[PDB]
Amino acid sequence: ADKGKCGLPEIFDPPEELERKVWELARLVWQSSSVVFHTGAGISTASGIPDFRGPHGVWTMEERGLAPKFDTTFESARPTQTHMALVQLERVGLLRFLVSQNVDGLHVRSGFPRDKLAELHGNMFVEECAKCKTQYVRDTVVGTMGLKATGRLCTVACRGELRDTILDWEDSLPDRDLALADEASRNADLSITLGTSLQIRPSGNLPLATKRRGGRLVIVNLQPTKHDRHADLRIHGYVDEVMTRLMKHLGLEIPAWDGPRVLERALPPLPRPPTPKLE
Amino acid sequence: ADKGKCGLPEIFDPPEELERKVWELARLVWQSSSVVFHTGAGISTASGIPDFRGPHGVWTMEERGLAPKFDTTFESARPTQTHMALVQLERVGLLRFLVSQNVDGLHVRSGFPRDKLAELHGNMFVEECAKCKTQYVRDTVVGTMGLKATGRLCTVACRGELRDTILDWEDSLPDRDLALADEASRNADLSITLGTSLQIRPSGNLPLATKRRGGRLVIVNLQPTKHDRHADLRIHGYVDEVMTRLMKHLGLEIPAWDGPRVLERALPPLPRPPTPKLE
Amino acid sequence: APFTADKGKCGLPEIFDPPEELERKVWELARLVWQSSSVVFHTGAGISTASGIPDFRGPHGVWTMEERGLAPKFDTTFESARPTQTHMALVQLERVGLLRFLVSQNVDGLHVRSGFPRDKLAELHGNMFVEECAKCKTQYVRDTVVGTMGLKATGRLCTVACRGELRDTILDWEDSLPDRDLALADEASRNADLSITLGTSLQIRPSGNLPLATKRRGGRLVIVNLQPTKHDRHADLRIHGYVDEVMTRLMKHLGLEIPAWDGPRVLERALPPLPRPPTPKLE
Amino acid sequence: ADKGKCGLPEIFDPPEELERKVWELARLVWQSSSVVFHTGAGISTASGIPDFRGPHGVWTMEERGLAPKFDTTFESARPTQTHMALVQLERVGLLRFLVSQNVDGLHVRSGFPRDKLAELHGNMFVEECAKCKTQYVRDTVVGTMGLKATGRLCTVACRGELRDTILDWEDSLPDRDLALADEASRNADLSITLGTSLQIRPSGNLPLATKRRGGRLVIVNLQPTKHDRHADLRIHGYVDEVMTRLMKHLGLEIPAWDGPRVLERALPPLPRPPTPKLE
Amino acid sequence: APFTADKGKCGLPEIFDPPEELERKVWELARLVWQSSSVVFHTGAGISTASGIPDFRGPHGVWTMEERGLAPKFDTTFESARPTQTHMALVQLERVGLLRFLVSQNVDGLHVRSGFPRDKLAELHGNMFVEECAKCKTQYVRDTVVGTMGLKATGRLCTVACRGELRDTILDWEDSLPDRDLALADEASRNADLSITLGTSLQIRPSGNLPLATKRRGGRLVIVNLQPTKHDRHADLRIHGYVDEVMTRLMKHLGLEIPAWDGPRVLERALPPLPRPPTPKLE
Amino acid sequence: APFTADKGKCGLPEIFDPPEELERKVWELARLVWQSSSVVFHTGAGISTASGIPDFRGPHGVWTMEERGLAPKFDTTFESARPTQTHMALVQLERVGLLRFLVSQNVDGLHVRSGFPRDKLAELHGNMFVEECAKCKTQYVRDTVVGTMGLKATGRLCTVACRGELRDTILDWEDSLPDRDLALADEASRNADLSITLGTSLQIRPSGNLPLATKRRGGRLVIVNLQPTKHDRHADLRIHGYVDEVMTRLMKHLGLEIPAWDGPRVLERALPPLPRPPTPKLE
Numbered sequence A, B, D: 001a002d003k004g005k006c007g008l009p010e011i012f013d014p015p016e017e018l019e020r021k022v023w024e025l026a027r028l029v030w031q032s033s034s035v036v037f038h039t040g041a042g043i044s045t046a047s048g049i050p051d052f053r054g055p056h057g058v059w060t061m062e063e064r065g066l067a068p069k070f071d072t073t074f075e076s077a078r079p080t081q082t083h084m085a086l087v088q089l090e091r092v093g094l095l096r097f098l099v100s101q102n103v104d105g106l107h108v109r110s111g112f113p114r115d116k117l118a119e120l121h122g123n124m125f126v127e128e129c130a131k132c133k134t135q136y137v138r139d140t141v142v143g144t145m146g147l148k149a150t151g152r153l154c155t156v157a158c159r160g161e162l163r164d165t166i167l168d169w170e171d172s173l174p175d176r177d178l179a180l181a182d183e184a185s186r187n188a189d190l191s192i193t194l195g196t197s198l199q200i201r202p203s204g205n206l207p208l209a210t211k212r213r214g215g216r217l218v219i220v221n222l223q224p225t226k227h228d229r230h231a232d233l234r235i236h237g238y239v240d241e242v243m244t245r246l247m248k249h250l251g252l253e254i255p256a257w258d259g260p261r262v263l264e265r266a267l268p269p270l271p272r273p274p275t276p277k278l279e
Numbered sequence C, E, F: 001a002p003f004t005a006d007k008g009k010c011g012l013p014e015i016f017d018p019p020e021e022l023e024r025k026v027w028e029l030a031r032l033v034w035q036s037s038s039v040v041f042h043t044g045a046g047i048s049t050a051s052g053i054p055d056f057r058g059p060h061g062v063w064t065m066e067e068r069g070l071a072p073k074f075d076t077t078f079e080s081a082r083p084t085q086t087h088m089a090l091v092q093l094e095r096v097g098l099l100r101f102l103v104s105q106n107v108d109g110l111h112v113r114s115g116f117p118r119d120k121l122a123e124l125h126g127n128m129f130v131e132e133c134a135k136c137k138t139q140y141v142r143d144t145v146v147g148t149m150g151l152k153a154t155g156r157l158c159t160v161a162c163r164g165e166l167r168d169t170i171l172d173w174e175d176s177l178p179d180r181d182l183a184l185a186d187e188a189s190r191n192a193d194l195s196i197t198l199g200t201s202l203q204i205r206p207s208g209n210l211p212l213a214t215k216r217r218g219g220r221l222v223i224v225n226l227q228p229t230k231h232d233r234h235a236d237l238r239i240h241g242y243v244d245e246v247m248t249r250l251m252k253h254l255g256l257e258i259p260a261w262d263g264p265r266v267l268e269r270a271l272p273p274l275p276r277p278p279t280p281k282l283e
């Protein structure tokens, strides 16, 4: 399995540069009509789920003969401030689409509308009827990885075989989620990447599609990423800190998490602050 | 007037059997794609409105030369825990349709969406223009029974004669409400009956329509009902206790009643918990 | 004893004030609450009938039906019963400092489960959810009814660190009232300048007489009941209507909302009062 | 510039007449299917913004060689009780349309749905792209009056010239807002005017259009207005007092203002009380 | 007496700090609140102008307009007036324990109706909604203005159980300040390490001098006013701007929301403080 | 001193109770909370790992990784860290009067920033956000970490009206525990009838021994930890699992919601308890 470059050194922007880049991110969100976010495992590290390629990442530790460490189970994990900031950005109509490589189920469990989300690598809580393609979002992890039989049968009125949604190394991306992600990415005038190294094709390349027809690209990550050279703005810090400052400049609160909830469909936007005068 | 079998003895499932049947009801709600509820006077007894055929029912007492007793007026009556649990089940998209034989106005006053409700026997708070068929939901009971003239005139811009909506013994069921009820009942994969003896045609037979094409039928009642033999599950207890345990297993709170409110149209579902793994 | 016990006057005819008289009496009750510095409420089984608990001496009361060879009807268990609008209005009146004390003959546990502060409540006849250590007198408020009546052994033992025998708090016919609850009820009743009675026939001694103590030194007495009561002649105002309708109108005149019930909750101690509307000019 | 009749004496209905007229207004709102409100500068005087023609109005003071006095800036001004009562009336589906002559931005900043609002004289917070006609609702006043260049450029993906939306004396009314106002006014069965002298054509005449095909007209103002003779009901008092009593009779609370918020689109109505029996 | 009464300097020119100076002064006010252990606020009629109550000595003040033969303008009645953003910011500052005491010259009743705790408020000039028993000194907070000015008989009688004559609390020109309110204001002012004045010209003795007591033993004084005030020279910081804009920016720097107003409410007694943000490092 | 300092047993193997045993132990913990009159919690670095703060002696602990020549990893700064479900469950347990005292070895500041009342909290090892006047002992809770460790001068001066030198509160290896916090922890621990330890290995003297004081005069001890702890043999119940999973199940059995975190807030003093569910019958 090609696991790419693992355990690169972290970069930390010093405070004054950090504060000034988040103001510039604010400016781009205000100026943009179609904003798409791309998330990876870096946005879940602050709730106790290790990443893949970070200092204590899954791959990084296995390369050194060590184990990844979980400070939580998938079921007891709480969405981060970043997760909840993405919920609110979608509710006030500032986020058009969310593209995620994470199988951790937290975006769905955060209350984020599934019809605005592409889970490119599947969802550990989601099993899907082989025949009728009906998905079930379960309250516990389904039990298998690699699109195998879970043991359970479809209940739609069918008795179809339910399989997990976790892609194995050689498994192709779900076409609907990839097509929705690719469509949102081409149409975006701003793509913001959060805690991904962007080292996986084609997930990691979707943000680049935004640069075609003059879109802007922002990369928020602690480590270098595959596409650092193509970004108009790279922010080297904790995504929780970036997103709490961004939300403060936008005049938005980060909503409370009520515990695990499934929203199928986005609502019309809630009221949002009026926009600053720019330049 | 055929008043059927009145004052049958109550049945109480003992606690362990009761707890186990409500878990089975939970399982059927989770497994079902289209759930229809049928309510009668048993769901209003806990707010001080007597039923018809129960031990102290209207008919039961008149058969013995006694009076029904009200512990409230129709106007001061509050929706029960069961009423409010039905509001929440509809808001989170677990209830497709509600079919009620009650004229007590509480489902509407509970905030329940009128476009998901069939009031088969009319509403004591609702008067309707003879000519333009415009309904008014009033804050007090309209004053007459049997589709007579209330005294008031239509205000749409008409001066049509306003009549009560309470069917007398020989009066046919409103076709729109009966057609919507019959349609929801045939399409349901689960019908749950709450505090009805099911002794009235065709209201009491609508739940049976669900058994055609393999639907399941659940009867919640203290007394035997006309159709006990056709049920996959009969729960003999207080509907308030059944529904508060059901809501607990589903991970749903019973919302506060803000006082009397009219919602014409259902909204898209609110977020709900993810589903348990079954079998 | 229990069989022969005097159950008083049962099944007396109900009275309904007509709407204009009813509307005018609730306005007068509002006026007396506004004018009063110490308001004490006395409740009985009439305030619980609208949540499916039958009363004792009403048309379908427990004693009334027994007299006719019939059974009373429950539309709920004690555990699944919800406090009425009246219960929740009393919670709010205490929170905004307009109720000084609450004196109740009810064993139905709903005042405590409503969230009403126990240090402002006298449960004269006990509480079906409450057991008490014979040894150290520590009370436990349970989530289910305790099991026994008549100050008997429940089966459970005290857990204070004692292992005392736990007993129910339900008075049998010949059992004396708890001294502390009677002394606090009697103290609040003498000091009240307004006593309001809700859904009691006031037929039991001394529970039913406590409201009269308010009339000494010029206190005013208000009786809210569908039936006549033992002390109708001593009342400055008698309201014949459903307590839920009286209390929801009263709360509307006072500018107070009836708070939501979160499900069963035990509050031991009252807080300082919440803000309340300013008072009308009365003259 | 024709500034009409300025500084007319105020009229105050005495309390018993005042209370009785607001009950009659309540009755007309209950009886009406399409209610349109017309607002002018009188509904903003209670938040410290002077009117034009009132005792201390802009024009009235300039006629006497004095200045208008502001007790607030446009940015720090809070919507009045009347503003917030109009928000709630629209949310519960009792207000069809709102027509405003005010440039003070408070209706938008109150959270009122822009697709139900006609700002006939423009909005001091709103600038608009000369070319693509895209509007921006800014957090501060834009800086110019009379449809001039603000200095800023369009950001839609264009670089169009942004202009203020404030009509000068000779500038024609925006056709879309005037057409929506005129359409709502003809279709209304009740028009209620709040704190306008109705002295400006065609804004001040729109309410009269309601009287065609038998609509009712209510004028709430402290001074005489151009069209007093055409009203079925004239209420001489503070609009805050009229609207707080009206809201009390309707059983509606006046919602909290969360600070400045932009809602583009109206939602389906929230639940509302059932209606009184009338006559 | 009333006709000849010295109404001081009326209609002095307004001052507007330009935006960058204004932004920097509010940051400095934030810093002084953070650094201070005892913060006392002094309010006058300037904090009520944004809800439609004209002031006394502003460009359109009551006295200013009288001097020019003109009338002041009300955009509201006293009863329909809503507390400003400033009123509600003072409520929150008291709730989170950052305001020790509030001293007000206003008779407009809005501080009380805002829900501000009366035991932390000195109403130096009285309250138009408040009448007081001549006999027993019991105050009543009414929902409408009481009717009279100058400590006269209102017409109503006391209801404590007294039948005392009820009088308004509005001081006439020659009437002495209530001793209790002056002594509590004077005590809080001497003990304050920060006094902030909002919308008063500080021209009235001794109300306008209380803030100076803070300067003794090294207290800091902040004056927020659109016009010059009697004591501008003694201030460590003078902010020339709209009080609503100053207080909404100050609350933003402090990390505090301005709470919703529920409509008119009377709170007699302050609660323990609510949680508040932790303090910035200052050096 | 610091280099040679005994860092105890680091990187001991993790234990996971299987789900049925885990479910049954949390039910037993629920039972002990219900049965107990004085419940004291002892927390350490294990309750902060789920918000991205590594512990000391866990598999990736600070000391564990140092032993292997590796670095610990932070997924957050101290300032951007959010309190865990466990932190917020402890807030609620204190609010409903089911937690008497909280004793913590953590310097991460999250208990204070969670809104937990400081007068019920002993921070045995100090708080990175808290500096203290050398002269007058006045503490300041800052919005950012103070800058220094080992009771050194921060650079700032006291603002009480004093100009005392402000020092950090972080104990160095040889620094004695603050007397007041140790005496209040020791007092609560002796008087507890239940001590529950969450995410501490209990290896530090005397912090790690305080829970044992509860076992004297028949107190019960519960240890919640993924690894063995120094005092496993003295525990009446050891739960080997994630503290977030244990505490969310415990709160579910108790009928309590885990309240929302508003962002960083300092509460100095506890309030009277909020209402809580009535207790199950246990026998």
Ligand SMILES: Nc1ncnc2c1ncn2[C@@H]1O[C@H](COP(=O)(O)OP(=O)(O)OC[C@H]2O[C@H](O)[C@H](O)[C@@H]2O)[C@@H](O)[C@H]1O
Binding pocket: A039, A040, A041, A042, A043, A045, A046, A051, A052, A053, A054, A057, A101, A102, A103, A121, A194, A195, A196, A197, A198, A199, A200, A220, A221, A222, A223, A224, A237, A238, A239, A240, F075, F076
């Ligand atoms: N709090 C944080 N803030 C900012 N950046 C962070 C944080 N925590 C970690 N990082 C950075 O977060 C980045 C995480 O990058 P990777 O670990 O490759 O995760 P992926 O989502 O991109 O991997 C995609 C797929 O690859 C796998 O095979 C699976 O199939 C995954 O689905 C690093 O650069 C960290 O520095």
Ligand SMILES: Nc1ncnc2c1ncn2[C@@H]1O[C@H](COP(=O)(O)OP(=O)(O)OC[C@H]2O[C@H](O)[C@H](O)[C@@H]2O)[C@@H](O)[C@H]1O
Binding pocket: B039, B040, B041, B042, B043, B045, B046, B051, B052, B053, B054, B057, B101, B102, B103, B121, B194, B195, B196, B197, B198, B199, B200, B220, B221, B222, B223, B224, B237, B238, B239, B240, C075, C076
């Ligand atoms: N709390 C309770 N929980 C459970 N069951 C209950 C409860 N209370 C009563 N019951 C049961 O509730 C059942 C109520 O049955 P019926 O009284 O016939 O009412 P309907 O709605 O079916 O009557 C339909 C029409 O008939 C009339 O002519 C009118 O036109 C009505 O509209 C009994 O079996 C009770 O045991």
Ligand SMILES: Nc1ncnc2c1ncn2[C@@H]1O[C@H](COP(=O)(O)OP(=O)(O)OC[C@H]2O[C@H](O)[C@H](O)[C@@H]2O)[C@@H](O)[C@H]1O
Binding pocket: B071, B072, C043, C044, C045, C046, C047, C049, C050, C055, C056, C057, C058, C061, C105, C106, C107, C125, C198, C199, C200, C201, C202, C203, C204, C224, C225, C226, C227, C228, C241, C242, C243, C244
């Ligand atoms: N919804 C209602 N609204 C108003 N009044 C009502 C309502 N329902 C009933 N009432 C009236 O409520 C009144 C209730 O009177 P009683 O039934 O004697 O109850 P107690 O609490 O005074 O019985 C005292 C003790 O006696 C026993 O032996 C036990 O020991 C009790 O503790 C009636 O007059 C009804 O008209």
Ligand SMILES: Nc1ncnc2c1ncn2[C@@H]1O[C@H](COP(=O)(O)OP(=O)(O)OC[C@H]2O[C@H](O)[C@H](O)[C@@H]2O)[C@@H](O)[C@H]1O
Binding pocket: D039, D040, D041, D042, D043, D045, D046, D051, D052, D053, D054, D057, D101, D102, D103, D121, D194, D195, D196, D197, D198, D199, D200, D220, D221, D222, D223, D224, D237, D238, D239, D240, E075, E076
């Ligand atoms: N609180 C109040 N309650 C009731 N009436 C009020 C109140 N305050 C003021 N009034 C009355 O409010 C009325 C305000 O009338 P005008 O001042 O002409 O404002 P417009 O909106 O109609 O002027 C329209 C345009 O004319 C300009 O050129 C601009 O272009 C404006 O856009 C008076 O009769 C006051 O008595």
Ligand SMILES: Nc1ncnc2c1ncn2[C@@H]1O[C@H](COP(=O)(O)OP(=O)(O)OC[C@H]2O[C@H](O)[C@H](O)[C@@H]2O)[C@@H](O)[C@H]1O
Binding pocket: D071, D072, E043, E044, E045, E046, E047, E049, E050, E055, E056, E057, E058, E061, E105, E106, E107, E125, E198, E199, E200, E201, E202, E203, E204, E224, E225, E226, E227, E228, E241, E242, E243, E244
């Ligand atoms: N919105 C505003 N923002 C800021 N400052 C303001 C505002 N509006 C007005 N001001 C300023 O607010 C200041 C208000 O000063 P004065 O009008 O003398 O009121 P007092 O409360 O001190 O009068 C004291 C007593 O005197 C009387 O005789 C009664 O007895 C009073 O109780 C002005 O300088 C305005 O610039």
Ligand SMILES: Nc1ncnc2c1ncn2[C@@H]1O[C@H](COP(=O)(O)OP(=O)(O)OC[C@H]2O[C@H](O)[C@H](O)[C@@H]2O)[C@@H](O)[C@H]1O
Binding pocket: A071, A072, F043, F044, F045, F046, F047, F049, F050, F055, F056, F057, F058, F061, F105, F106, F107, F125, F198, F199, F200, F201, F202, F203, F204, F224, F225, F226, F227, F228, F241, F242, F243, F244
């Ligand atoms: N999410 C989790 N859930 C449950 N247990 C956990 C979790 N994460 C870690 N643990 C356990 O949490 C335990 C934490 O034990 P230690 O790391 O020694 O921390 P202390 O607070 O007791 O260190 C005391 C002092 O020593 C220092 O020198 C400083 O001065 C400290 O103040 C481990 O056994 C983990 O298994």
Ligand SMILES: NC(=O)c1ccc(C(=O)NOCc2ccc(Sc3ccc(N)cc3)c(C(F)(F)F)c2)cc1
Binding pocket: C002, C044, C045, C048, C053, C054, C055, C056, C062, C105, C106, C107, C108
């Ligand atoms: N709102 C309220 O407070 C409220 C209202 C009603 C009730 C109520 O009905 N509870 O049961 C008490 C009861 C029932 C029957 C008998 S008769 C009897 C006698 C002997 C036996 N073995 C069985 C029944 C006896 C009593 F007192 F007579 F025993 C007592 C409780 C509380």
Ligand SMILES: NC(=O)c1ccc(C(=O)NOCc2ccc(Sc3ccc(N)cc3)c(C(F)(F)F)c2)cc1
Binding pocket: D041, D044, D049, D050, D051, D052, D058, D062, D102, D103, D104
């Ligand atoms: N909601 C409202 O009622 C409301 C009230 C006022 C306003 C508002 O400010 N609009 O401009 C009107 C205006 C202002 C000043 C002058 S005089 C002037 C202007 C600028 C300078 N530099 C000097 C004098 C003149 C006018 F017409 F007299 F010129 C006209 C907007 C809304």
Ligand SMILES: NC(=O)c1ccc(C(=O)NOCc2ccc(Sc3ccc(N)cc3)c(C(F)(F)F)c2)cc1
Binding pocket: E002, E044, E045, E048, E053, E054, E055, E056, E062, E105, E106, E107, E108
């Ligand atoms: N925010 C505030 O606190 C506030 C602001 C303004 C006001 C205010 O305007 N209230 O009326 C007081 C008043 C008005 C006119 C006169 S002149 C007069 C004299 C004699 C008669 N008969 C009538 C009017 C006299 C006063 F003091 F001079 F009498 C007193 C009240 C409160």
Ligand SMILES: NC(=O)c1ccc(C(=O)NOCc2ccc(Sc3ccc(N)cc3)c(C(F)(F)F)c2)cc1
Binding pocket: F002, F044, F045, F048, F053, F054, F055, F056, F062, F105, F106, F107, F108
């Ligand atoms: N949840 C919690 O409470 C929590 C968990 C973890 C931590 C934590 O990691 N904080 O830093 C303390 C620390 C780090 C390294 C060293 S080693 C060292 C020695 C000398 C220098 N100059 C630098 C590093 C030393 C210490 F103690 F050894 F110094 C102390 C803090 C709090």
Ligand SMILES: [Zn+2]
Binding pocket: A129, A130, A131, A132, A133, A134, A154, A155, A156, A158, A159, A160
């Ligand atoms: Zn299938």
Ligand SMILES: [Zn+2]
Binding pocket: B129, B130, B131, B132, B133, B134, B154, B155, B156, B158, B159, B160
């Ligand atoms: Zn009609």
Ligand SMILES: [Zn+2]
Binding pocket: C133, C134, C135, C136, C137, C138, C158, C159, C160, C162, C163, C164
């Ligand atoms: Zn005991």
Ligand SMILES: [Zn+2]
Binding pocket: D129, D130, D131, D132, D133, D134, D154, D155, D156, D158, D159, D160
């Ligand atoms: Zn453009």
Ligand SMILES: [Zn+2]
Binding pocket: E133, E134, E135, E136, E137, E138, E158, E159, E160, E162, E163, E164
């Ligand atoms: Zn008196």
Ligand SMILES: [Zn+2]
Binding pocket: F133, F134, F135, F136, F137, F138, F158, F159, F160, F162, F163, F164
């Ligand atoms: Zn000091």
